[PDB]
Symmetry: D3
Subunit: 248 residues, 6 copies
């Protein structure tokens, strides 16, 4: 297996003979605790995934009963210092750019609560969720800083520019069933069946010729990439200013 | 209180100690009758609201049991003369530019029928409607002129580019419940409870730091502003030509 | 008393009333359309001809029999694996959507049954009515192993959003008429026997508008749509062409 | 030879064995007098050129000592009537769309004064001008109507958004030499040598593979097409309102 | 005289019977010293100009021997506090939006050094400069903050995306003659002849019908407005972060 | 020094105490011969430069008397096979994205002929050229494939959409003085003075605060990045089809 499969302490990699790669986020085998380390390393991981032509379909998932519900806030660095925030800003632009530049279909298997960094899910092509899943933008309006890391672009795409703004301004929580009705989640599965269904869909896709998988992903992500590129830097800059203001 | 609070005969202003500003449209205390005067003055009122940093959350509403269901068509001026339409054209560009440029969250409390100028509602972040509310683009195809004052952009944004065109071309009426299922309306309230709920949401928002309220509004309106800019002048110029054509 | 182009296209029947309402019906020898290289080449010219004729005041686009478009003659498209032949399909694929969008009056789709290919045509139109037997799918691309790059890649994610739209295309999902109605793609669901009369009823109400209002309302309501199609159509069809070449491998 | 070679009373066509097509605008073999007829027909001619895959390089030129310096104003129809202007508007959008959608390199051989419709030249890839050539947007501000037919987009694209606005607002005239210094004209030739040089450049281009000629044209016009599409309708609608306003005062 | 003509202590207004309005920036009769006050008031002045339909052509100029060469930096407020910078940010978006939304042709008469806020000039249609004029983006790299107030968009639009970046990054100074060769300045005049020439060009323009003046300005600013919209907020936010960072220099 | 300084056999790196990084392209110490290897590795090198916050100003240059005048065309692989061209396509997208995402000012010191890959230069902020320099798009029309690797966007951006198309379609050569008059080259220097002047400009820049350097680069590249994104993939796909056609 490629060297990058063991380069990331918070990502487990497993790939089959069909080139189906499962990337699973974890903290010591448990549900991911998001950290400054993952904020820095995940952009490199997604770049590494995107470079490797042997990846023909990607499944992105978490561990345990949450997709991402925990954060080690201090580990992010002093966000109120613009010279530190700049690292977050640069990494925040790269993570979405590098995710979107994965050049094959990407299946999200959302294995439970997704209360931060749900923008990752909203780069993917097929979204499956376990019945216990809840979606929220929790951290931004908790901290008093702009939801400017891509949720501001992708949630109003997903829900429209009316419900999307309501969702973000009120920190609305959506159940898996609500997100399914809203066309964000495409299938709701029992916890015990989610991963098998992800792999089933992946095996069906993997029967396609490789260039077809790659160029269908390209065709279907052009508009998405343009919309992310329009707003991501500005959102993260605004967010930085609001983080600085926490010292006032 | 600022001078502009008493500058507009068709707008009542009330602001609390948290910077929550309720702007209520009225004609001598009744539901608004839209006029050439409001078409001319509203862009200035929205500019004034946007300039005043003491406004931290804005609630925009009407009076009585309709949000806007009446128009004084002669008071608009001779729309069939391009020299008079040009006033309407310039003001139609400015009203939406200035309304979008309010730099804090805007809550619509839609207190009944919104049969004209519903595009104002479609600039706002949180949309609440009383159970008696109905939405329609009434006047344009009644008059034989283009629905080109922003409804052509914002209704297809709200409903998508399929149902939105059907809605405009057939002058479809949507109930509050239909609009809620279409994600345009976020909460449906009894008439007697609507304003209380608007203020409840506003007070929660107002606990955010001021720069976060402002910059979250900025981040969440970038794409919306671009889309309105793209089409508003062209729509109003085409509408003017069809107004001239009423002479033929 | 009728334009020459009304009888120029062996796969399109034309009928226009005194109000300028033109019904354009796709067919193969009076049956449901079998899409061919011929229709791929000719339909862009037909749509241009429709758009040029100012006597068209509202257009109804429909199929024949119990399917809107559910059949294709693959060989008749030409040797798609040769880029010199695909380039014909490419140029015609750009023109067909540009020309269809540039029809300058409201267009009503009366979807009279299965739409399993070329549903992007429907997704240029303003009012979408479907008979209750209608199903929507992007059938042929992932069956052949080539990119869904002829406009479905732009318009289905526009219609369903960029999440369900991608699921729909990558899994070749089938949507029923009720599903599409709940998804805001179909605006009315009708029994088969009532579909065309409803299309004509809506058209007659529209045709009471002044002519410039019909034209300029269509223009105002299609600006953003035209920009979105122009952004992605050539790129999708070029990528599709490369996957067609790759079929030789 | 294709039928369309003899379809246009104001365009002479000839094509060599290399697929190099020269399209020459004329009025009875003399310099073109622009008319309502050319405004209506030129969009169809440019479409016809673009459809024909045997065209591998195009040279667009005029006749005699002017590229286009005359117009028959009455023949344009009653521009002050929005129902008549709408024809000009629709044709004004189509002519640039269809000209840009010629899918091979286009060489302008500007054979003298270009005082109206110079936007056609600003769709082309290689611009050659005779020493006698002058460029101007003459007619719009002489008539009191908006320069909204594409010159408002393409002249500021050619001269930048500063000199381009100065040029339009003041009806500036540029000699061939000035236009060369401004990078609009690429070579200035003696009158008697212009056409030979156009053909020389065309023959060098024609040695390229056909798909390379077509796809290089596509790659090099994507941005240009987006910019034209952004402003052409709006410009023409504003121009129409100013034409209506000529009935006022 | 409208009330707004005497509302702004740093702008003198004079309008003739043809609706030609000259707006002259000054500080108590001398060349303008830019302040927090002008930063806050100028967006309202430009809005007021744009609202008043009696303005048919506008001439924007400075006083004395400089267009704008001085700034009272302390009067800008504590730029290092994001709560204070936010006023500058909001006003910095409004000033260019409101200036571009003047709906008639705008002539710049650049009467000498333009070392700050030259982006105002780069919204205008016709740029005239006295022989003594120099252009520079002086203050941003002298302070150590981003040139994010519109110069980052408009200088690369004027000079192109290569020379425009060199000009900003190296704080290049351009003479009037250099700017003329670069197509930014359209006419270079002796100091004593500058204003007469601005008025001559304005009187010629004022002979046009009013709607033509307005809609030609609209047609010629659509792309310009989109480009400024794209980048102005982001530039000013970035500039704000670097202003906060001045505490750490 | 960072590990990446010695990771690229065709790039020499030197960085001073002010964070001025000189990146010099070479083949065994001589002028660069462009290869499939550099096509693959340069995107990673430019990513590595962009990630390293100790880089405060970058100077990009070549070796010897040419910036890039030679290409090992066969080392690019079988460009006529779409499965091999896809590597070139993916890498062609990444190299410009990654070069543009260098987040500090980039000075080109063009040390001679730039007959291929001159689009790299057209991402940079300050362009200095030795007097022997000539610019041309040599390889595309020599091979009969589309100039679709970014030159199709950036040369018309530099020279305008008229001269730019002339330049590409006729394989025009521009000398350093011609490029200077066309505003592409900003200073023309004798060969022996070129690098000293690059470093002089760099040292003046490096006195700025770091965030100002970074965010001035960001502000000045937003439009440029959007224009590259618009057309880079389409150009490389069209180029690929023309490469396949070389078999016909």
């Amino acid at each position: 297996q490629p060297e990058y499969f063991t380069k990331y302490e918070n990502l487990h990699f497993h790939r089959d003979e069909n080139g189906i790669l499962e990337v699973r986020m974890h903290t010591n085998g448990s549900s991911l605790v998001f950290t400054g380390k993952t904020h820095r390393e995940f952009p490199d991981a997604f770049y590494d995934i995107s470079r490797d032509r042997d990846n023909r379909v990607v499944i992105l998932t978490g561990s345990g009963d949450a997709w991402m519900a925990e954060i080690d806030f201090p580990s992010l660095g002093d966000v109120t210092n613009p010279r530190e925030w700049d690292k977050t800003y640069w990494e925040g632009k790269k993570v979405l750019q590098n995710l979107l530049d994965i050049e094959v279909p990407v299946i999200s298997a959302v294995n439970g609560a997704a209360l931060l960094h749900s923008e990752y899910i909203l780069t993917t092509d097929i979204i499956l969720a376990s019945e216990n899943t809840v979606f929220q933008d929790m951290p931004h309006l908790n901290a008093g800083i702009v939801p400017g890391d891509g949720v501001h672009i992708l949630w109003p795409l997903a829900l429209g520019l009316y419900r999307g703004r309501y969702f973000l301004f009120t920190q609305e929580k959506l159940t898996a069933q609500q997100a399914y009705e809203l066309n964000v989640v495409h299938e709701v599965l029992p916890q015990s069946k989610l991963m098998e269904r992800a792999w089933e869909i992946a095996r069906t896709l993997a029967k396609q010729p490789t260039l077809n998988l790659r160029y269908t992903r390209v065709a279907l992500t052009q508009r998405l990439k343009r919309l992310v590129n329009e707003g991501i830097g500005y959102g993260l800059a605004l967010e930085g200013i609001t983080a600085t203001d926490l010292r006032n």
